Amino acid sequence: AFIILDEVIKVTNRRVNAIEHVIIPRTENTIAYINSELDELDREEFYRLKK
Amino acid sequence: FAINKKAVEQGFNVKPRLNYNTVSGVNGPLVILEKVKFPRYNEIVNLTLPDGTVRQGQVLEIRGDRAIVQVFEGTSGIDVKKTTVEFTGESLRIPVSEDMLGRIFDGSGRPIDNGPKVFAEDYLDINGSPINPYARIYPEEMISTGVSAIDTMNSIARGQKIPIFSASGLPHNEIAAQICRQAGLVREENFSIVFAAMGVNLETARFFKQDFEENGSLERTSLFLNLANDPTIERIITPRLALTTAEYLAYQTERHVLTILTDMSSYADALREVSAAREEVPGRRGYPGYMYTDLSTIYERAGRVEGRNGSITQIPILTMPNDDITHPIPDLTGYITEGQIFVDRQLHNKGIYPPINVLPSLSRLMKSAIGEGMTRKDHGDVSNQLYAKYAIGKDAAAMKAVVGEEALSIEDKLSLEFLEKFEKTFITQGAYEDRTVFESLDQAWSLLRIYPKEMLNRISPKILDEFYDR
Amino acid sequence: EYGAIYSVSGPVVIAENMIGCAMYELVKVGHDNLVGEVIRIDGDKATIQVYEETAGLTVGDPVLRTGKPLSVELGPGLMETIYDGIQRPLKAIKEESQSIYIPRGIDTPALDRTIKWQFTPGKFQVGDHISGGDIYGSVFENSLISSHKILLPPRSRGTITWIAPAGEYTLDEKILEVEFDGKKSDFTLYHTWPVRVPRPVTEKLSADYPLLTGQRVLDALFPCVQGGTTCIPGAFGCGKTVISQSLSKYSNSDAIIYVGCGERGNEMAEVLMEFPELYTEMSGTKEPIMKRTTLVANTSNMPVAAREASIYTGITLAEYFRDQGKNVSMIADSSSRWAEALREISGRLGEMPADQGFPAYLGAKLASFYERAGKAVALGSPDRTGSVSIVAAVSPAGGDFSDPVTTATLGITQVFWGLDKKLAQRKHFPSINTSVSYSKYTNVLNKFYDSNYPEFPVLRDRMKEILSNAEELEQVVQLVGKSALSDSDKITLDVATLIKEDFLQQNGYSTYDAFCPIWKTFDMMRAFISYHDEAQKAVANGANWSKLADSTGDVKHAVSSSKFFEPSRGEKEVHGEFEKLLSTMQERFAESTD
């Protein structure tokens, strides 16, 4: 039981660390980039309509 | 004498100028005249509000017998029945002379130090003209700034144009002050300074003034100050005046100028401000399309020339809006300038001064700078090895933080130790701690000895044999 | 006859009383006769784009006409000199003015009109029949180019009535007369041609000869054919200047036309004073390179409009040299600057924009410009052959690969050399993203390869799959670690790192690492693949790779250091050295693995 618990907790802890330190930053940077692009499009659309 | 005199004999050429009274339109920062006789593109006019105050401005468009004058100091209060516009008949120009040194000027270049008007030697158009490439020589001499992070892995040559990226709330001002205080050559002291700040708070201006006072250098420099309270449109003029003075000094007096602009971000903001006033096509993030060309015009006054012994060097300071390199301002600035020095947050958050990282820094003129007659052959290889090991240490630290210490090979722990020692001792230095290239490189050798000799790859065997042993 | 200015807005000028004006006709404006180009015509008025600074212009200034479009003067003397964007020699301007700036409105002949050339007649005699594109004599130009063929301009044909004899002439002499219906024809050593009209040609062809570049990765994985096109994106830090300079220097082209559209400018001085001492041995020996180049420099500081005509002038000159039968190879510096100039002009003109503010015809313009490249057979009797191979270098704004200009270019070009930023930051100087970068002339080149190196194609794919597998395993090992890794996977990762550190790194400063012939790279990558194959065979036969690698030892160092062999030693001595290294490595794996 000791061995099994040790290996299981090691695996889960490293997985949690990897998720926290990799996934969330990677996705939120993309979120910001997408927001920036969608904000960019409307600017030129408004310019064209103004013209 | 006679040669010089013939170039000035045309001064005695009095010419009356006509002042109209037909202001027939106004909106935003623009004023529209009518029934003007033979306009002249991009000239200077002097308005006179009904209360007697006079503002300046230049025409930007010429339709059939009507000029769209643009005003600098706002347009509020302009009357249509009493105002009187006047034409100088010539483009914008400023006086110049070697006596400007030790004086302080406002954004428009008039003295603000209680002194008299400059006893001009001649007048010059602010915009200047390009330099044909055939009359240009790239530099091959290294300046010694004393800052190890610069003078080791990113050298500076007399003639380069190296911007200093930065973020709001960091000690870029102190870095610039230290550089100007330690602007000596590797090896007189002709380094005149034409510091020209636009859109800055009062404390920055006073700090710069005191810093110049303490080093006994004010008598060797000129100041172009333009604080925030001043009009925005006028902002875009100061750098041109500064560069005009710098080039005059460096190409008609054989001096060695050293210009340090600041907050080009504010200049770009002013460009956006009076660019959206009109309806010209926007670029990215609402910025003007031709900002690239304008910034090229501003920056492309650098380097040495054929005949003149004089030189010039630009160290503009940028302010990234939200700590993004991909912002258009730094994008174009990097596209133009020759390498740059960078600053990070975490290093500053870690109390490390000067908080300079080197991974994103770059300098093209290093190849011509380093060599034998100025430094030891090892110079370049040492820097390359430092780059490689620093990057490996960074990635190893990231991976270790991810997984743990179990998978970190011996080399990984060595890289972590090297990174720690590097960032803790190699970069850190005092506010008045100089470091000539020789001692800095000697100290740098200490950090690499931690590594076993064989693994060192990017360094040639001769350097290892002749230097590693000691 | 004359016209008066009617409105000015920076670089655009609108005149009036302009009735006989055509579209795109060249015009001179101002009291200093600044050059322009009519664009749109509306009754009396006609819009003009100005090719110089417009400061101090006043309404009422006279406007002239020329009745002919923009054109460039070809002929002897073009080469070894430096021109601005509108075909003006630069050294002559500086010497004549004794200044450091460019005096607005200054005019000089395109080609020197004083020097004399040792002309020799061709093979035609009075009474013969000739047509456009036939040679009628050679001219001595330089030790590197002994024969500077002179040509009959296209769209001009007849029968020669009088010819000049051998001797020394200036290019103003009328050395040939052609008798058409009338005798209205005279021809000196030079002529002109409208830039916007591509030069005629007998017929195009298929390029099947590699354009050697001297770069290991470029020549190995993404070969460029002599006659095609390429593209080199960047992020203002990738250091693309290195490959441009290296290919302009050590390539096997007969001539090269470097053109700078919106450059830092200082690089022009760098190349100016760097080339004059770098010798080539293509013909004879020791001839300095500067006798093999023509520079069309236009710094970003100089007026916006000239950035348009600069590339047209460059491509036209390249076509002219190609027509002589010499495999010229033009190279641009920054196409994005051209698009920026076009966008600025369009916006100022006041017209509806397109994607990201750019006009709508930019894609068509880019396609038309790129189409001019390609191998072909000259137009004339001698039946000479030439080729052109342009190499553009786009520069996006945000550093990504989604801006309109890059997307438009990628639909036209057929070779893609993307440049990463992080790899450059790591000083892995030939930083090429081997994931997205691709070539398209791979299959066709087999005709050359089988004749010269039959085994190369299989080996390149071997390395490609090795790298792909390493990149596929990197993320899993990062997210898990080496705990769940088999020996073969570790072997693959180690060899991938070895390749990335040895076969992909280069530096154009070491004598041995400045130019890698085809044979050297062939043998080196052969050795790499053989090493990996022997390691895989041994581990499959059974052995702990952790134990095996330490014993293997010095052979890994030997293959890593193989690149240090001096290129051009014997071309066969190095071949024997590679053979011996392979044999000893195989013996080591036979025994060390045991």
UniProtKB/Swiss-Prot annotation, chain A:
Give the domain of life. Eukaryota
Starting at the broadest rank, the lineage of the source organism is:
Eukaryota, Fungi, Dikarya, Ascomycota, Saccharomycotina
- Disulphide bonds in the chain: none
**Which named protein is this?**
V-type proton ATPase subunit D
Function, in words: Subunit of the V1 complex of vacuolar(H+)-ATPase (V-ATPase), a multisubunit enzyme composed of a peripheral complex (V1) that hydrolyzes ATP and a membrane integral complex (V0) that translocates protons. V-ATPase is responsible for acidifying and maintaining the pH of intracellular compartments.
Extra remark beyond the main annotation: Present with 8500 molecules/cell in log phase SD medium.
Subunit structure of this chain's protein? V-ATPase is a heteromultimeric enzyme composed of a peripheral catalytic V1 complex (components A to H) attached to an integral membrane V0 proton pore complex (components: a, c, c', c'', d, e, f and VOA1). Interacts with RAV1 and RAV2 components of the RAVE complex, which are essential for the stability and assembly of V-ATPase.
Q: Which family does it belong to?
A: Belongs to the V-ATPase D subunit family.
- Stretch of the intact protein here: 155 to 205 of 256
Compartments, as annotated in UniProt: Vacuole membrane
Curated annotation (Swiss-Prot), chain B:
What single Pfam family name could you report for this chain, choosing any that match? ATP-synt_ab
Q: Where in the cell is it found?
A: Vacuole membrane
What coarse category fits the chief subcellular location reported for this protein?
membrane
Which terms are listed as keywords in the entry?
ATP-binding, Hydrogen ion transport, Ion transport, Isopeptide bond, Membrane, Nucleotide-binding, Phosphoprotein, Transport, Ubl conjugation, Vacuole
Molecular-function annotations in GO: ATP binding; proton-transporting ATPase activity, rotational mechanism
Tree of life domain: Eukaryota
- Annotated binding of ATP, by residue: R364
Phosphoserine sites (modified residues): S129
Matching InterPro entries: ATP-synt_VA_C (IPR055190), ATPase_a/bsu_AS (IPR020003), ATPase_F1/V1/A1_a/bsu_N (IPR004100), ATPase_F1/V1/A1_a/bsu_nucl-bd (IPR000194), ATPase_V1-cplx_bsu (IPR005723), P-loop_NTPase (IPR027417), V-ATPase_su_B/beta (IPR022879)
Biological-process GO terms, alphabetical: ATP metabolic process; endosomal lumen acidification; Golgi lumen acidification; intracellular calcium ion homeostasis; pexophagy; proteasome storage granule assembly; proton transmembrane transport; transmembrane transport
User: What membrane topology does this protein have?
Assistant: Peripheral membrane protein
GO CC terms of this entry: cytoplasm; cytoplasmic stress granule; fungal-type vacuole membrane; Golgi membrane; membrane raft; proton-transporting V-type ATPase complex; vacuolar proton-transporting V-type ATPase complex; vacuolar proton-transporting V-type ATPase, V1 domain
Summarize the protein's role. Non-catalytic subunit of the V1 complex of vacuolar(H+)-ATPase (V-ATPase), a multisubunit enzyme composed of a peripheral complex (V1) that hydrolyzes ATP and a membrane integral complex (V0) that translocates protons. V-ATPase is responsible for acidifying and maintaining the pH of intracellular compartments.
Q: How does it assemble?
A: V-ATPase is a heteromultimeric enzyme composed of a peripheral catalytic V1 complex (components A to H) attached to an integral membrane V0 proton pore complex (components: a, c, c', c'', d, e, f and VOA1). Interacts with RAV1 and RAV2 components of the RAVE complex, which are essential for the stability and assembly of V-ATPase.
Additional information: Present with 131000 molecules/cell in log phase SD medium.
The family classification in the record reads: Belongs to the ATPase alpha/beta chains family.
What protein name applies here?
Answer: V-type proton ATPase subunit B
